[PDB]
Design a protein around this ligand. Structure first.
Ligand SMILES: O=c1[nH]cnc2c1ncn2[C@@H]1O[C@H](COP(=O)(O)O)[C@@H](O)[C@H]1O
Ligand SMILES: O=c1[nH]cnc2c1ncn2[C@@H]1O[C@H](COP(=O)(O)O)[C@@H](O)[C@H]1O
Ligand SMILES: O=c1[nH]cnc2c1ncn2[C@@H]1O[C@H](COP(=O)(O)O)[C@@H](O)[C@H]1O
Ligand SMILES: O=c1[nH]cnc2c1ncn2[C@@H]1O[C@H](COP(=O)(O)O)[C@@H](O)[C@H]1O
Lengths: 189, 192, 186, 201
């Protein structure tokens, strides 16, 4: 459950020094997690997931992508998993299933209060071999729940980008950023 | 449209000189298209798509992922489109819908052999009063006689041989392969 | 102007990123992950191409200063090639590791500035047509024409940056501790 | 069974379906090896090199790049090497040096040198180097060549690690040059006639 903990002292990275979608010129305060940061973290995370599912003699695993917030995370994550199982010479069959007794790894976007991931975990437990949750981001409240694999622990702010949406928008953004009030007013109701 | 033609005389590249997942040891005949070649073609496909919708004045574009096969394809293609939209400074909003009104729908599918699936899907799209309906296909099977229909954007035109990898499946197996490969008969029998 | 890494930033723990097992105990933290470098180099390359399009430069010659900037030159040349290629412009590029009267973009690793002064001074012998300098990192006052990150006055390794021809194979840009700083003393 | 063989029947891919430097628009016949295919090959090459130098417990391993021609191949090769060593917990200390010869210590002795060159054709350019390296009392001298030209008759020398075996046509791109041009090209291509006349000696 230990991860890259973004402290509330971190002010982020201003958008002017990166490549963001020109569509969101005035709508972003700063970049929180660059895209390459996400990739680099997902490498080590892929190693952790693989060696965990080898410590337990798992015959196979099935990733469950929760659309549409976890697609980029699932894509890069599957790249890292196939890469790791490729280099290490293991024979670990992985399946991918998208939803809006087998080993199930939930591929989620972010945990805020946990009311959504717990209904899923209780939905698959309604007779499954195993149920695990992997979340790219985690929100620091503290919440009583934590996923099994966590990439980043972020402050109590609303983030967008990397297929994370603020009212069905900002998904085509390359990095993980925090909206300001201008974009909030522009894309909310 | 015109694309990279994988000639029938192409013998492929043997899997031993690339990285294959260990679970398909004696199941792959050869490697037809390496992953990196797919990506390098997807760069040009992204440019073609973006400046097509820029020749038009599309207010947005809605990509339709045809699951489960087109998921890697849609991933790297969305990376290409995003990378050329922000590289040319053009404002062009892109949304992503998934399957298994009055918008510019770009269908993203894995391969087209006969065209039954793409015909049914396109017919379903024609009822919702879409602004435009274009189709982007990664692979196109060269059949005899040549198939009556061809997509608006095509990555590779490959021979009439069953291919797997890059999320191309064979009874929900072979998806976790990095490259597009032709199966042998031992692998076709191994999964039934 | 670039990305400023303030001094109150402790970095990220090495145990959360993939690092070479060679330097298990010799790394305090990571300042800048590798992918963040890759994402900043996009904007930096765009800035360089835009400066060489404000005027009509008919050529550009990148000067790699081995051994520190070979990774930075690799990904920088990749970004420049990808930008020139993406914008359909005809910007011919050469790499220089006797070829004079050319626009020079010096690709150095990090800058006191006493080394870059030796570079620019040595350039006056051939009299280049134009000289500009781009550096990946700057430690805390002089500034090159293109800067990527601004780091504290601490010591950084990785990404071909070396402490006595060492730590170059490290993927990310890290900060070492005193035990590692003494385990590779010259 | 040394490497990927690009048979003489292979006609390549037309340059219009890939992203090419627009200045060489009319100078390229076709694309021989796309960039991503090169990197895909360099994954497996990195694995082979790593487990070779680990099977014999090589203390140090020093990659020597033949400069200008072999730079990009060195960069992607080092990428793959550090990646595959990172994913295995292996400790394999690698160094990097460069040559054009322009590199001398003379402490190269007792070390394991891995030569990183761009392409082998006749074999004399590399033979002079291996002769100049086996004179410094090195523990081992091996060569990694990205491309190898198919010669008639077959060349009496084949490097230890080969990426691709290409037909006997002239190739450019991916730091491969023709009269110090075509280096900024992204893929490995073959020059046509207009490109052969546009950069003559
Ligand atoms: O900061 C955010 N940005 C975008 N979506 C969020 C954010 N925080 C929570 N969500 C979404 O809120 C939903 C429920 O999260 P919960 O509050 O943990 O139950 C999920 O779909 C999350 O992706
Ligand atoms: O060779 C193949 N390998 C894997 N899937 C194929 C192949 N050929 C056709 N398909 C599948 O066939 C479906 C539609 O093809 P069609 O109906 O023949 O046009 C798609 O969902 C493809 O995944
Ligand atoms: O923190 C560091 N780690 C490794 N090398 C450094 C570091 N800081 C400066 N250098 C090297 O110091 C030399 C000159 O730097 P300058 O004195 O700031 O101009 C160059 O070779 C740099 O690579
Ligand atoms: O087809 C080619 N394209 C570009 N450079 C080549 C080609 N063939 C050989 N070279 C270069 O010319 C020299 C030929 O070496 P040799 O023929 O093995 O003795 C080496 O420096 C090669 O890098």
């Amino acid at each position: 459950a230990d991860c890259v903990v973004i402290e509330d002292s971190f002010r982020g990275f201003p958008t002017e020094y990166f490549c963001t979608s020109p569509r969101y010129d005035e709508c972003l305060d700063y970049v929180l997690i660059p895209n390459g940061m996400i990739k680099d973290r997902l490498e080590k995370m892929s190693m952790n997931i693989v060696d965990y599912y080898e410590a337990c003699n798992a015959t196979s695993i099935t990733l469950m992508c929760v659309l549409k917030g976890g697609f980029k995370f699932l894509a890069d994550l599957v790249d890292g998993l196939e890469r790791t199982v490729r280099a290490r010479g293991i024979v670990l069959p992985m399946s991918v299933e998208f939803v809006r007794d087998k080993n199930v790894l939930v591929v989620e976007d972010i945990i805020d209060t946990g009311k959504t991931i717990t209904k899923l975990i209780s939905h698959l437990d309604s007779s499954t071999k195993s149920v695990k949750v992997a979340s790219l981001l985690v929100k620091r409240t503290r919440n009583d729940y934590r996923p099994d694999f966590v990439g980043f622990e972020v402050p109590n702010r609303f983030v967008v980008g990397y297929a994370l949406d603020y009212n069905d928008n900002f998904r085509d953004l390359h990095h993980i950023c925090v909206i300001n009030e201008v974009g909030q007013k522009k894309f909310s109701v």
